[PDB]
Amino acid sequence: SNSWAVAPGKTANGNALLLQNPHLSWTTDYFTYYEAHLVTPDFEIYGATQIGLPVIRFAFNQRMGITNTVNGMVGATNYRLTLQDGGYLYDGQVRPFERRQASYRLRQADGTTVDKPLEIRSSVHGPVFERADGTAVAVRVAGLDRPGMLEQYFDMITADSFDDYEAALARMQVPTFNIVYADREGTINYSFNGVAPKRAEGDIAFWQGLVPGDSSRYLWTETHPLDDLPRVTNPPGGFVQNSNDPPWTPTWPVTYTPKDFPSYLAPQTPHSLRAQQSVRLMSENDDLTLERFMALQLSHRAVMADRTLPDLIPAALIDPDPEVQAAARLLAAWDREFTSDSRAALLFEEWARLFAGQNFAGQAGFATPWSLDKPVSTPYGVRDPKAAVDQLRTAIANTKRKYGAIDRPFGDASRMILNDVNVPGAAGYGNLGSFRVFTWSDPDENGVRTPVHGETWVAMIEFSTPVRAYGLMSYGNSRQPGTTHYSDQIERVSRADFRELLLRREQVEAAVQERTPFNFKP
Amino acid sequence: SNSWAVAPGKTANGNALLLQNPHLSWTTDYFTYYEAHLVTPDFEIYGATQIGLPVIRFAFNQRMGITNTVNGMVGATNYRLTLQDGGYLYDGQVRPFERRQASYRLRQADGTTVDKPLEIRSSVHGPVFERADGTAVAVRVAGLDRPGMLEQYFDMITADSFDDYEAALARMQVPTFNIVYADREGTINYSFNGVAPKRAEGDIAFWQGLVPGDSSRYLWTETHPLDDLPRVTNPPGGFVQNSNDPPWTPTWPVTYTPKDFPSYLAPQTPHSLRAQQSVRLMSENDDLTLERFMALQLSHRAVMADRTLPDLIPAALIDPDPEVQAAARLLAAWDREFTSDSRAALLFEEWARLFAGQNFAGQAGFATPWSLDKPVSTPYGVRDPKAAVDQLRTAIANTKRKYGAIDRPFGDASRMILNDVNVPGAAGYGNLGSFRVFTWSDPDENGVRTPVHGETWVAMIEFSTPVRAYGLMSYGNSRQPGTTHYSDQIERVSRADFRELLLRREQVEAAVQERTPFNFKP
Amino acid sequence: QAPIAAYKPRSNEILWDGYGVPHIYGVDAPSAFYGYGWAQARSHGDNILRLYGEARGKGAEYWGPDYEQTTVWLLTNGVPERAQQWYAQQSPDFRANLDAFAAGINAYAQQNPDDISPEVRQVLPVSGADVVAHAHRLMNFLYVASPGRTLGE
Amino acid sequence: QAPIAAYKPRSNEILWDGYGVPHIYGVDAPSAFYGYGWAQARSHGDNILRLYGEARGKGAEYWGPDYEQTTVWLLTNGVPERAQQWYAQQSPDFRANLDAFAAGINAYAQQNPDDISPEVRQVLPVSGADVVAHAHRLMNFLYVASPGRTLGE
Structure with a gap:
């Protein structure tokens, strides 16, 4: 999941921008998102939320909006x-x-x-x-005595000011999640939310494993109030972000360090390449417009390639095998973007699977390890070029086995298939640096793979007056047997063609297809 | 100076390619090159050479061709x-x-x-x-007893086969220079040429300084034969090159190492970024055509930017000064090419002057030092981001002082002015990574700079039948008072529009402007 | 400067656009939640019913072996029962919204019985407690404490 | 496979193209070198004459103070005299080419006296030894041993 909130001072028109970008399974039922719009004389809410839930978690209206990402609160x-x-x-x-x-x-x-x-x-x-x-x-x-979870979210997404929002957030009824806020007044906030028990000793690694159950020393009974958790409001960098990375670089320049909080709150593991891209995309750009903002959400750079190819290519070129030499020239001519026509992308993933593990999170192969002092430029380099070339040799074999060639177009193998709709894919694994995410499955007999997780509900809002918002839902708004609204958005996703989100009554009336008047017996 | 020779197996049509690319002062009289064509019943030579010299040093004809670069033979x-x-x-x-x-x-x-x-x-x-x-x-x-220098070059550029060429080269009458050869048979050769005295002890650094003159132990009297000097013929990499770098990576993969020769022959200092680019451009490309070959000669990448900006930009963005932040965003949006419209290039040079010294050869600022094991990907990184940002602050002041702004177009300040012709410049310092070189002078009152040294005689030849060659001479073919052939080529240089070199009688007759019949009294 | 005038609904209606997105207008909060439940039932009825069935701790009873582990996990952690307490502890006004939501789901199912999958009909009728239970399961026993992490699987 | 037929000149002529590039055709080697010298004199006469004057060790004598250091450097290193030896040691056939080259430069100067700068006319006539001297100065006492490196400047 990604999340961005930009302050007015960093935009061209002076309005805050917000990005709702949760990444979740495309098949797990309880993880399915549903888009809806609620209007009442007293409130208005628009957004997505998991089916079965009566409150919208990814909501926004004419005044404010919030979004969530996973923080893995150890509760x-x-x-x-x-x-x-x-x-x-x-x-x-x-x-x-x-x-x-x-x-x-x-x-x-x-x-x-x-x-x-x-x-x-x-x-x-x-x-x-x-x-x-x-x-x-x-x-x-923790928090088995907090029954107001649903009501707290309701009061948050329905707040009349940042103060009311903060007061609601302070109840501590929502047990987890990173939460990002933005409103038309120009306030942006990032909160490492959740119900965390106060512990006397031990770091996060200790509390994540099996703790001794034969000592009252490890039996906690208290939890931290909002004040103890990492939070950032209107930082000087003019932006706030979180891509599932620890809360140590929510903005740039940072406003606090790991030592300012209990060591059991969050890990101090290296930030993924996607998270590093997130910080770079925001900090490096100014005078942002909604159009420019949206274009940035689509970035699908193979950042790991930028950190490895410089060392890998020269070393592979000295290998006598003409195929390895050919593979190296193929990777050298690649622009390092996960586009549909890329002929080197698949081969690079296969090499990466060996170099950095199946989940691409490995650090052992790098020459320069990750450092919080260079959070967006490390790790870097190939520690053992010779060994890296052996891995490439194997990667060539694996690429042919899975796809039938070392230069098959990325979008020919990577497909988005919903019902009768079959469209070419683009972008890929977040751990390789892709900001827009599509976690492709293993290929089938024919080397065809599809998204298993990734972009689901996607929305970018500009808090102008009236607000302007665009969005898309990968797998449609309905999954009932025989619905016409399951595969009717995947084509637009494929072309990055966002729908304008309709909040104003006149826009809604102009797009109505069905009307369901109803009588509710109070 | 640059030099490339490509074997048939690495080209699309199967013909060898050769690049003559000497870099020398644009004002020193004895360094001035002159283009000419000599035809006799017994031989034909085309090419450039320094004025006053009766033999063509950068020559080629229908069968072969050679080129030279400086090796600094310590003779x-x-x-x-x-x-x-x-x-x-x-x-x-x-x-x-x-x-x-x-x-x-x-x-x-x-x-x-x-x-x-x-x-x-x-x-x-x-x-x-x-x-x-x-x-x-x-x-x-050394070699004060070698009177056949002029005749050896004559016999070399007039050789009927690689064997005769080699026999001529073996006389050891030419005291210095790296020499690259290529012919229509498909042979390519690189030779670290010169007359080097045999020494009993000491490395190159010892023999370059003042040697004790009170001991017969240091009085040499012998010199090395061709067999002892570094040479490469038809290497497996299919190419040969030299950009004034030590002879340790004349091709890729290499065919020898520093330990195979006396330590006083050549230095083992880090290869410049231009030399690193040279190796990459050749080794990374295949199926070369003359057109593709020429396009590669024009590369003007700010390689140092690729090795430093990743670390510099994030660090500069945390500085409170909005101008430093602005400079960082300017450098971040730059494509790192020394094009005419670049608005960040000048500012980058100024930062580089501080980071790596006035000649850009400094190594102290890098995080990862140069290593012969990663000859084309090191040095890399910024060792002290904090200090690097202070240097950037100063660079901003120096850029404004010299050019009047931090974002003035590169080609607006960098000009090529000959007589009444004033054209925009492109490409730059070789030590920053630019392959095509233009060593710009210090700016004038108005921030205008011109080339002081760099591209002079430039020619690329394809040994097909008949041969095909294109070339250009920055400062024309004449420097006599009031000539019309001094500034008549600088415009073409500016547009990288090469002239076809005319070797065949019918082409010459079709382009004749003046005819000077002459009678020589034997 | 203030935001644009908010619309004031005069009748309860759901306006669906070309993509099956419901725009629910209610004269009051309960009516809005009722419409929301009706819309969700129409769009994701089968799966919502299945999920609520599991939150009751009746997954194994309704659908068998594949749902047994979750049943043991939820019963052992007392999720169904705690949902009753939490439901009972809701503020009067919010509880009314939870009941209306549930009523919306039942209404849809009642008016369009053939749209609900047979194997999931046994779950009807649903209630506000079912809603609280599902939210409790999702937050606390999926996002915070997952069975895999405890069972060591 | 062999290269294309080489052209066989039947008369001595210089064909200059649009860029002032000379295409010298000679019935024999000496004639070709003569034309080459003539062409170079026409294109870079003044500077070639100045350079040859310095190679003789007469830079200070002809042009003064600014040329004195080089004069001392060349005289002390015995460059002018060694050029005489080297010239005397040239093969008969190649020496003829060196003489023809020099003759070409003199010829051009003689036929077009007003094209040669006044301050450099005193150098004429040049000879094959001057050619050897300049080549010797350039190679050995500029490229290999430069005065700055020795004088420590």
């Missing part, structure tokens, strides 16, 4: 228990479990049901689960 | 003498000087002359000169 702890004498060890003493006999029905293939007993055990930490290896684990989840 | 030694008792100390004994009373006339401002006595002293090393500080220096020059 739950898994404790390894020490079982003994029918209970568990705690501070040198055997404590008893709290047991409860429950039961549930299980449907059989024939349609009938059977009753299955279920014993529910709990330690002082929480519910106990047994793993395959026999390890007894107790799960402690 | 002379300066010895520091120890004067004592009317002689000099040598192996613990006072040796007498060989004296000679000479005299010469000196013309006065009024036109008359006065007689000045001149005593000529010589030690066993050679002629003795006294420096300002009083240091007595003796100069020993």
